[PDB]
Amino acid sequence: DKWEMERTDITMKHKLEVYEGVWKKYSLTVAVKTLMEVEEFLKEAAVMKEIKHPNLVQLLGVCTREPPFYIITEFMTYGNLLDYLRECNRQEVNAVVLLYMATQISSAMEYLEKKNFIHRDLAARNCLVGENHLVKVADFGLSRLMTGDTYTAHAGAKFPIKWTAPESLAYNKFSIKSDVWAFGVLLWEIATYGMSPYPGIDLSQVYELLEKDYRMERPEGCPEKVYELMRACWQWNPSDRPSFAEIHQAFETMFQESS
Protein backbone atom coordinates (compact mmCIF):
# COMPACT_ATOMS: atom_id res chain seq x y z
CA ASP A 1 0.00 0.00 0.00
CA LYS A 2 1.08 3.59 -0.85
CA TRP A 3 -0.46 4.60 2.57
CA GLU A 4 1.63 2.02 4.52
CA MET A 5 4.80 3.52 6.08
CA GLU A 6 7.86 2.75 8.35
CA ARG A 7 7.14 3.12 12.15
CA THR A 8 10.74 4.41 12.75
CA ASP A 9 9.98 7.31 10.31
CA ILE A 10 7.77 8.97 13.04
CA THR A 11 9.26 10.50 16.25
CA MET A 12 6.87 11.08 19.22
CA LYS A 13 7.01 14.54 20.80
CA HIS A 14 4.04 14.94 23.23
CA LYS A 15 1.06 12.92 24.57
CA LEU A 16 -2.22 14.75 23.74
CA GLU A 17 -2.97 7.10 22.63
CA VAL A 18 -2.92 10.31 20.40
CA TYR A 19 0.53 12.08 20.13
CA GLU A 20 2.06 15.15 18.51
CA GLY A 21 4.81 13.73 16.30
CA VAL A 22 7.24 14.52 13.45
CA TRP A 23 7.52 12.84 10.05
CA LYS A 24 11.34 13.20 10.16
CA LYS A 25 11.97 12.76 6.38
CA TYR A 26 9.43 15.63 5.67
CA SER A 27 10.22 17.75 8.83
CA LEU A 28 6.38 17.89 9.17
CA THR A 29 4.46 18.01 12.50
CA VAL A 30 1.85 15.26 12.52
CA ALA A 31 -0.75 13.70 14.87
CA VAL A 32 -0.24 9.94 15.49
CA LYS A 33 -2.77 7.64 17.18
CA THR A 34 -1.51 4.32 18.68
CA LEU A 35 -3.75 1.21 18.53
CA MET A 36 -10.38 -5.57 20.61
CA GLU A 37 -12.20 -3.22 18.15
CA VAL A 38 -8.72 -2.26 16.76
CA GLU A 39 -9.54 -3.75 13.28
CA GLU A 40 -12.70 -1.53 13.14
CA PHE A 41 -10.54 1.61 13.65
CA LEU A 42 -8.27 0.50 10.75
CA LYS A 43 -11.39 0.01 8.55
CA GLU A 44 -12.55 3.54 9.51
CA ALA A 45 -9.04 4.79 8.71
CA ALA A 46 -9.22 3.09 5.22
CA VAL A 47 -12.33 5.27 4.43
CA MET A 48 -10.13 8.47 4.99
CA LYS A 49 -7.93 7.29 2.04
CA GLU A 50 -10.90 8.05 -0.34
CA ILE A 51 -11.61 11.67 0.89
CA LYS A 52 -9.58 14.87 0.13
CA HIS A 53 -10.93 18.34 1.11
CA PRO A 54 -9.35 21.54 2.54
CA ASN A 55 -11.87 21.33 5.50
CA LEU A 56 -11.43 17.60 6.42
CA VAL A 57 -8.56 16.26 8.65
CA GLN A 58 -6.03 14.77 6.12
CA LEU A 59 -4.89 11.15 6.49
CA LEU A 60 -1.13 11.00 5.74
CA GLY A 61 -0.09 7.42 6.62
CA VAL A 62 -0.75 4.14 8.42
CA CYS A 63 1.31 1.39 10.23
CA THR A 64 -0.64 -1.93 10.01
CA ARG A 65 2.17 -4.60 9.91
CA GLU A 66 3.15 -5.02 13.61
CA PRO A 67 1.63 -3.99 17.02
CA PRO A 68 1.09 -1.20 18.08
CA PHE A 69 -0.56 0.19 14.92
CA TYR A 70 -0.13 3.90 13.90
CA ILE A 71 -2.68 6.17 12.20
CA ILE A 72 -1.06 9.43 10.99
CA THR A 73 -2.99 12.60 10.11
CA GLU A 74 -2.17 16.31 9.67
CA PHE A 75 -1.72 18.24 12.92
CA MET A 76 -4.32 20.84 13.93
CA THR A 77 -2.44 23.42 16.07
CA TYR A 78 -5.36 24.78 18.21
CA GLY A 79 -7.18 21.57 19.22
CA ASN A 80 -11.00 21.19 19.07
CA LEU A 81 -13.58 23.92 18.22
CA LEU A 82 -15.51 23.43 21.52
CA ASP A 83 -12.46 24.33 23.79
CA TYR A 84 -11.41 27.01 21.22
CA LEU A 85 -14.75 28.85 21.27
CA ARG A 86 -14.95 28.76 25.12
CA GLU A 87 -11.36 30.07 25.62
CA CYS A 88 -11.16 32.63 22.73
CA ASN A 89 -11.09 36.47 22.71
CA ARG A 90 -14.60 37.13 21.36
CA GLN A 91 -13.42 40.58 20.10
CA GLU A 92 -11.06 38.63 17.68
CA VAL A 93 -13.48 35.67 17.16
CA ASN A 94 -16.45 37.90 16.18
CA ALA A 95 -19.66 37.47 14.00
CA VAL A 96 -17.62 37.34 10.74
CA VAL A 97 -15.35 34.60 12.20
CA LEU A 98 -18.44 32.69 13.43
CA LEU A 99 -19.71 33.01 9.80
CA TYR A 100 -16.32 31.90 8.34
CA MET A 101 -16.22 28.74 10.56
CA ALA A 102 -19.79 27.71 9.53
CA THR A 103 -18.90 28.22 5.79
CA GLN A 104 -15.80 26.02 6.31
CA ILE A 105 -17.85 23.20 8.03
CA SER A 106 -20.76 23.29 5.45
CA SER A 107 -18.12 23.16 2.65
CA ALA A 108 -16.71 19.90 4.15
CA MET A 109 -20.25 18.54 4.60
CA GLU A 110 -21.38 19.48 0.98
CA TYR A 111 -18.38 17.43 -0.24
CA LEU A 112 -19.33 14.37 1.93
CA GLU A 113 -23.00 14.85 0.87
CA LYS A 114 -21.93 14.76 -2.87
CA LYS A 115 -19.45 11.83 -2.33
CA ASN A 116 -22.29 9.88 -0.44
CA PHE A 117 -20.60 9.77 3.05
CA ILE A 118 -22.15 9.96 6.55
CA HIS A 119 -20.42 11.57 9.51
CA ARG A 120 -22.57 10.15 12.46
CA ASP A 121 -20.84 12.42 15.15
CA LEU A 122 -20.92 16.09 13.96
CA ALA A 123 -20.22 18.35 16.99
CA ALA A 124 -17.90 21.28 17.79
CA ARG A 125 -15.77 18.73 19.83
CA ASN A 126 -15.21 16.74 16.54
CA CYS A 127 -14.12 19.89 14.62
CA LEU A 128 -10.46 20.75 14.78
CA VAL A 129 -9.08 24.27 14.64
CA GLY A 130 -5.91 25.39 12.84
CA GLU A 131 -4.37 28.87 12.64
CA ASN A 132 -6.41 31.95 11.57
CA HIS A 133 -9.77 30.37 12.47
CA LEU A 134 -9.19 27.40 10.12
CA VAL A 135 -11.70 24.61 10.75
CA LYS A 136 -11.38 21.04 9.53
CA VAL A 137 -14.11 18.49 10.38
CA ALA A 138 -12.80 15.31 12.13
CA ASP A 139 -13.34 12.45 9.64
CA PHE A 140 -12.34 9.39 11.70
CA GLY A 141 -15.81 7.63 11.78
CA LEU A 142 -17.28 8.17 8.28
CA SER A 143 -19.68 5.63 6.83
CA ARG A 144 -19.97 5.31 3.10
CA LEU A 145 -23.52 4.93 1.71
CA MET A 146 -23.07 1.59 -0.16
CA THR A 147 -26.80 1.20 -1.01
CA GLY A 148 -29.59 3.70 -0.33
CA ASP A 149 -29.80 7.09 1.42
CA THR A 150 -30.11 5.63 5.01
CA TYR A 151 -27.49 3.88 7.27
CA THR A 152 -28.76 1.74 10.18
CA ALA A 153 -26.55 1.63 13.30
CA HIS A 154 -26.44 -1.68 15.23
CA ALA A 155 -29.20 -2.17 17.87
CA GLY A 156 -27.74 -1.21 21.25
CA ALA A 157 -25.44 1.62 20.13
CA LYS A 158 -25.41 4.71 22.30
CA PHE A 159 -25.40 8.18 20.64
CA PRO A 160 -24.76 11.86 21.82
CA ILE A 161 -28.55 12.52 22.28
CA LYS A 162 -28.33 16.40 22.28
CA TRP A 163 -26.87 16.18 18.65
CA THR A 164 -28.78 13.08 17.42
CA ALA A 165 -31.80 13.56 15.09
CA PRO A 166 -35.26 12.10 16.08
CA GLU A 167 -35.34 9.21 13.54
CA SER A 168 -31.79 8.25 14.69
CA LEU A 169 -32.86 8.27 18.38
CA ALA A 170 -36.10 6.34 17.70
CA TYR A 171 -35.04 3.93 14.84
CA ASN A 172 -31.12 3.99 14.71
CA LYS A 173 -31.53 5.37 11.08
CA PHE A 174 -28.82 7.87 9.87
CA SER A 175 -28.71 9.93 6.66
CA ILE A 176 -27.07 13.13 5.37
CA LYS A 177 -30.31 14.86 6.67
CA SER A 178 -29.53 13.40 10.16
CA ASP A 179 -26.05 15.10 9.70
CA VAL A 180 -27.98 18.27 8.65
CA TRP A 181 -29.80 18.06 12.07
CA ALA A 182 -26.46 17.56 13.93
CA PHE A 183 -25.01 20.52 11.90
CA GLY A 184 -27.89 22.72 13.27
CA VAL A 185 -26.88 21.88 16.87
CA LEU A 186 -23.24 22.67 15.88
CA LEU A 187 -24.51 26.13 14.61
CA TRP A 188 -26.07 26.69 18.08
CA GLU A 189 -22.64 25.70 19.58
CA ILE A 190 -20.78 28.26 17.33
CA ALA A 191 -23.49 30.97 18.05
CA THR A 192 -23.22 30.39 21.86
CA TYR A 193 -19.38 29.93 21.95
CA GLY A 194 -19.36 26.28 23.09
CA MET A 195 -22.39 26.29 25.41
CA SER A 196 -24.04 22.85 26.05
CA PRO A 197 -27.15 22.19 23.92
CA TYR A 198 -30.62 21.97 25.59
CA PRO A 199 -29.16 23.58 28.85
CA GLY A 200 -30.36 21.90 32.03
CA ILE A 201 -32.76 19.62 30.04
CA ASP A 202 -32.84 16.04 31.39
CA LEU A 203 -31.41 13.85 28.55
CA SER A 204 -34.18 11.22 28.98
CA GLN A 205 -36.80 13.89 28.04
CA VAL A 206 -35.12 15.39 24.84
CA TYR A 207 -36.75 12.93 22.32
CA GLU A 208 -40.34 13.52 23.73
CA LEU A 209 -39.77 17.35 23.70
CA LEU A 210 -38.63 17.32 20.02
CA GLU A 211 -41.81 15.23 19.19
CA LYS A 212 -44.00 18.14 20.47
CA ASP A 213 -42.00 20.68 18.29
CA TYR A 214 -39.75 21.88 21.13
CA ARG A 215 -36.54 23.52 19.70
CA MET A 216 -33.67 25.46 21.26
CA GLU A 217 -34.13 29.29 21.71
CA ARG A 218 -32.26 31.75 19.38
CA PRO A 219 -28.91 32.63 21.04
CA GLU A 220 -28.19 36.24 22.05
CA GLY A 221 -26.62 38.09 19.14
CA CYS A 222 -27.35 35.23 16.70
CA PRO A 223 -28.49 36.60 13.26
CA GLU A 224 -32.17 35.85 12.41
CA LYS A 225 -31.04 34.39 9.02
CA VAL A 226 -28.68 31.97 10.82
CA TYR A 227 -31.42 30.96 13.39
CA GLU A 228 -33.79 30.30 10.48
CA LEU A 229 -31.15 27.96 9.02
CA MET A 230 -30.77 26.24 12.45
CA ARG A 231 -34.56 25.82 12.55
CA ALA A 232 -34.66 24.52 8.88
CA CYS A 233 -32.01 21.88 9.94
CA TRP A 234 -34.26 20.81 12.83
CA GLN A 235 -37.37 19.89 10.77
CA TRP A 236 -39.01 16.67 12.09
CA ASN A 237 -39.15 15.12 8.58
CA PRO A 238 -35.64 14.49 7.12
CA SER A 239 -36.98 15.36 3.59
CA ASP A 240 -37.86 18.89 4.85
CA ARG A 241 -34.20 19.67 5.97
CA PRO A 242 -32.05 21.64 3.44
CA SER A 243 -29.17 20.02 1.49
CA PHE A 244 -25.58 20.76 2.58
CA ALA A 245 -25.27 22.35 -0.92
CA GLU A 246 -28.16 24.74 0.12
CA ILE A 247 -26.57 25.47 3.61
CA HIS A 248 -23.04 26.13 2.17
CA GLN A 249 -24.52 28.44 -0.54
CA ALA A 250 -26.40 30.52 2.13
CA PHE A 251 -23.32 30.77 4.43
CA GLU A 252 -20.88 31.60 1.57
CA THR A 253 -23.35 34.39 0.58
CA MET A 254 -23.70 35.65 4.23
CA PHE A 255 -19.87 35.67 4.73
CA GLN A 256 -19.31 37.49 1.39
CA GLU A 257 -22.09 40.05 2.35
CA SER A 258 -20.44 40.49 5.81
CA SER A 259 -17.30 41.77 3.96
Q: Which residues are catalytic?
A: 121
- State yes or no: 39 annotated in a binding site: no
**Residue 183 annotated as lining a ligand binding site:** no
Using CA atoms of 221, 222, 225, 227 in order, give the dihedral in degrees to the nearest 10: -140
Residue 115 annotated as binding site: no
Q: Is 78 annotated as a binding residue?
A: yes
Q: How many C-beta atoms lie closer than 10 Å to residue 10's C-beta?
A: 21
17 marked as part of a ligand binding site: yes
Cβ contact 104:55 at 8 Å: yes
Cα radius of gyration rounded to whole Å, the chain:
19
Known binder of ligand: residue 84? no
Annotated binding-site residue? 156: no
Is 74 annotated to bind ligand?
Answer: yes
The dihedrals phi and psi of 145, each to the nearest 5 degrees, come to: -85, 95
Three-state DSSP class for 136?
A: strand
Tell me how far CA of residue 130 lies from CA of 39, 146, 197, in angstroms: 29, 32, 24
Binding residues for ATP: 16-18, 33, 74-80
Binding-site residue ranges: 16-18, 33, 74-80
